[PDB]
Point group: C4
Chain length 304, copies 4
């Protein structure tokens, strides 16, 4: 005998089905473990040409990221984006403060990476110029809705006035929006609006974006390691966290400890999560769910 | 490449599908922004021949509307209906108290608009006569269920004994009910009963009513700007608010401030909401959802 | 034009559809009002040969029914069943205490009706004999699950040793169970177990039972007038209430007032509910939902 | 007439349907009672060659099972597994402490049964050797995810170095995982991970495992007698309880009383539950749901 029929759903049937799901609406069926967790490689792609030893990224929120944070984040394997809710002069001053840890994220010159947010209005161009000076590695046009002529133009701009600077498009949740931002020439995409339901939004935008070599950043909703694993598993290349970090020490302010103990923790969990599903890298988990090897299963409200 | 398949649901498939939805059961997928929010025109139709610079309307509730309120409402772009839970003499006295702000809603003689509720019994005819005198612009046969012979007759009555006065039909939730009220000759419709689930009720009654040129007032359930935008987007021409206003200053009684700061706020949000979905007027948003350009997506309970 | 397509669901499609619904899982679409509420006739059938001027019935619970209650209930239009959680001698003593109000429920000799619960074991036969003496009108074999050989036999028994006494079968939720109890010869049925979901249970058991002329008592879950109206509308001939009454004065013990003010209230609401849906009697409401004139609509969890 | 159509769902349609259900997502339709509860035989199979007079099994949790508990459990009809969160020397010392009650679970030599958990790493082999000495009856490779090469090998090991010792495989939730553990040669299976949703997990793994004569232990989620009955009814041969017992007296620590009063209680309820559905043994309940005689019905979130 020994034939075993066939597990649950395939990412496709589940996230193209008038569903509209969250991270908590489904679980993932385990696989075959035949190696240890510490062998799981979490290397991820932040933008077409920026790569991290971990998929973690902090949010451009005054209550979250600022030099202090941006630094730890990079030392430990991630990267941070400074909030533009301050004087342009104050922001670029943060960017420069930032500019053993085998994982440390560094530029082509041994320096910790740093990114920062900027609006899509005129006055922002100046801010940009200060930021570019302080040696910023990447910029993220920070908007709740990004499929606008005001972002498309700010993109075509920066893409020209600064060819070696990587640009990340404003928040989108459909492939109809992503198209435009990818034509204007963005180097990555920030997915999230309402935290459309997140999981379904990530699934959809990644599925289109990969066809062009554009990474996707799962932005919003991450509450625990689980959500992170589910967000990567659906297509996201990296994950952005806001509130889940606002209680660390490196956070600007008056729970948890330093980013130097928390981040390691997260990385541990995530590899452990990649073991349970029998994948050795994150790249492999994405390949599995697109092929149909990785199976899922919905949970009822009362089943949560 | 660059083809992008096709977004979520179309208002139709979603609100004719044994669903029975609320404002919180679904979200709307964003569109293409290529203009500023302050360019969004919120002009709406209260009744076949009454038109406002904003879709806002206050409720005929003693805890909400009375002269003071009715006035602000009109100065700012809306309109109010005085509650008939008082002596006929007291009600019409409110109507007369009422009878820069470029938006100010005015009659053909520079006077702020005013409306008021009245029952469908005999004794109400008198009340009417006092109200008509004080110069009331519109009357709304105020009932929990309006598809009755007692309203059909009160309609045919008022429609005759007062040809220049606009009549709004009592609360309905189906197109089977709306038919009768539209034949008796109402000039508009008040949709809501149980706050059937509201969103599905608005969708349905508007879809039928538009075929006759009869506006629909989304009555009940509005808790925040979002619900307002969703209610208009489904077909409603205007929106009536009760409790969301009962905490303003212009409200009769012993949170929030004056209607002169709140209303502006609401108008701001609503245009902003119309931007996110790429529509320039409310008229355009309705045209988009009826055509199938505007897309939606359901959220699970646990996805809320 | 004026054609109006077609309202929601038909009781059938909705309660034979792997649903498993509660009273709160759905609402009923309004109809055409063309008469006043006080014209609604609430006459209902308790058992094949017992008939009440209202569908109300109190529960055989020590915390609810006992002589005092049983009396009010009948004076006002209902009927009560005394709890058998006491000495047989004490129970029959209650039955005898019981043995203007135009609605008053009376026997063929001007006496208030009274019913009472009894087990299905040997010792219960004696209890019965005392009860029959005190002039009890009806008996209800009181069990959580009634499709047993121990009830079938207690039925065939009582049906013989007392031909003029009406017997009500123990709690069932399927038509598979009802069959047996109806063959043993019961004169009515008590539906409810888990308060299977109630609404679906009532629907199902009534649909089968009517084919034999056996009334059904919706037992359990009634929290407000609404549930009562929905329970009758689904097929139930009468409704049994436990906790909703335990806070009246006529209740045995140390909220609400007397049954003489509460019951009237309930009757008022129920007629009002029968108006909203355009039915003049309860008999008519049942006829409407079986024909397909009466329409329903499900509500999502988040739509409740 | 008297034909009665056909009850609800069949375990199959319901637990192979992209559902993902919990114990609370459904109920079971009653059957035909024609015998007393105390006639219900709860004999169950713990492992291919271990059999208990009741399906109860305590959890390998320091907050739950340890000698004291393990003993009561066996005296009353169940069995316990000592937690390996202690020195190997301390664990085997518990096993030996353990090594009228007609139900008492005993070895071939009049001694109370005892089982215990052990990891799947090298160092665990030693622990094993101490445990085997103290006369342990069964071992349960204790892991959150069991489909690993590290468990498959620890199985093939123990199966050889100790032929008369019964081995239970680490936690699984699919038949894809169960296959491997059954080939390595386990004598039973522990189902549960996330407490995939439990009910659906039990259903699935039992359905495959029975084809090989391998019992399944429903592990996790049991909160009351009901869940226990539903877990057995779906295919499980026995049920493991953690927290529901942590408040007994026999539990290690500083609610409820002794296991000698609680367990009886549970057994009583469970037979009563087997009566309501007309089954005389647990073996019969499983046979009924696999044949399609036993019917179920889903409940909406708002129907819970
Ligand atoms: N990530 C998210 O989804 C999210 C949610 Se709230 C949030 C944060 O909240 C902020 C506010 O959201 P907004 O939609 O206001 O975003 P943004 O700050 O981009 O402002 C959008 C408004 O700015 C206008 N605008 C931009 N450039 C313009 C120009 N050159 N000329 C004329 N009008 C122009 C837009 O048309 C629009 O109404 C965002 O900047 C971001 O920092 N992000
Ligand atoms: N908008 C809503 O959905 C809603 C919910 Se409660 C609510 C407010 O609550 C009030 C009460 O709801 P009701 O259903 O009682 O509404 P209404 O005040 O219209 O009264 C309805 C009752 O009045 C009777 N009636 C009306 N005219 C009659 C006449 N000429 N002869 C004989 N009977 C007549 C109806 O037949 C019915 O039973 C409403 O008037 C309204 O102010 N509105
Ligand atoms: N209405 C309801 O659904 C409901 C829920 Se609880 C509830 C009340 O709780 C009480 C307990 O529920 P039960 O299932 O125990 O109901 P009941 O009091 O009918 O007792 C049932 C038990 O009594 C046994 N029994 C009855 N007659 C017997 C006889 N002559 N010989 C041998 N065994 C016999 C049954 O086989 C069964 O295990 C009910 O009597 C009722 O008063 N009613
Ligand atoms: N029953 C359950 O579902 C459940 C949930 Se939490 C839980 C308890 O929590 C504990 C922890 O869960 P874990 O997944 O850590 O389970 P376990 O204690 O089996 O440890 C698993 C980790 O140990 C590693 N491992 C095992 N043998 C190894 C070997 N010989 N060489 C190299 N690596 C090896 C695995 O590859 C894996 O990453 C379990 O042991 C159990 O006691 N059980
Ligand atoms: O990770 P959490 O805290 O859920 O949310 C992170 C995302 O929240 C969004 N956000 C931040 N402040 C906001 C104010 N209002 C609404 N959304 C906001 C951003 O897109 C940010 O990256
Ligand atoms: O806007 P909210 O406060 O949800 O509700 C407004 C609507 O509530 C209804 N309403 C007012 N008082 C009521 C008393 N009982 C039930 N419904 C009421 C009216 O139709 C009113 O316009
Ligand atoms: O009307 P409520 O209070 O919901 O419940 C009434 C029904 O509850 C049931 N009931 C009473 N006591 C019970 C104890 N345990 C479980 N069910 C009970 C009976 O069937 C009774 O007629
Ligand atoms: O019976 P309850 O208390 O729900 O859970 C019992 C099961 O819980 C699991 N478990 C115990 N401690 C755990 C720590 N973390 C997660 N799962 C655990 C085990 O599989 C155990 O047999």
């Amino acid at each position: 005998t020994s034939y075993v029929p066939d597990d649950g759903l395939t990412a496709q049937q589940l996230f193209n089905c008038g569903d509209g799901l969250t991270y908590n609406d489904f679980l993932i069926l385990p696989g075959y473990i035949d190696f240890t967790a510490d062998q799981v490689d979490l290397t991820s792609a932040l933008t077409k040409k920026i790569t991290l030893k971990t998929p973690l990224v902090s949010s451009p929120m005054d209550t979250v990221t600022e030099a202090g944070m941006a630094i730890a984040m990079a030392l430990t394997g991630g990267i941070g984006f400074i909030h533009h809710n301050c004087t342009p002069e104050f922001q670029a001053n943060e960017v420069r403060k930032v500019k053993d840890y085998p994982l440390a994220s560094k530029d082509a010159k041994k320096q910790l990476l740093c990114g920062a947010a900027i609006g899509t209005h005129e006055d922002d161009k100046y801010r940009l110029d200060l930021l570019a000076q302080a040696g910023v590695d990447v910029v993220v046009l920070d908007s709740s809705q990004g499929n606008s002529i005001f972002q498309i133009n700010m993109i075509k701009y920066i893409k020209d006035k600064y060819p070696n600077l990587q640009v990340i498009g404003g928040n989108v949740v459909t492939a109809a929006q992503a198209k435009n931002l990818i034509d204007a020439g963005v180097d990555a995409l920030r997915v999230g609006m309402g935290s459309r339901p997140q999981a379904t939004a990530v699934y959809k935008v990644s599925e289109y974006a990969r066809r062009f070599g554009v990474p996707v950043i799962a932005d919003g909703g991450i509450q625990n390691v689980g959500h992170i694993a589910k967000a990567l598993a659906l297509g996201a290349s990296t994950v952005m966290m806001g509130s889940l970090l606002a209680a660390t020490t490196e956070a600007p302010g008056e729970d948890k400890g330093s980013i130097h103990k928390f981040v390691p923790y997260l990385i541990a969990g995530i590899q452990h999560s990649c073991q349970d599903i029998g994948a050795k890298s994150l790249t492999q988990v994405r390949a599995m769910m697109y092929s149909g090897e990785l199976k899922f299963e919905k949970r009822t409200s009362s089943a949560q």
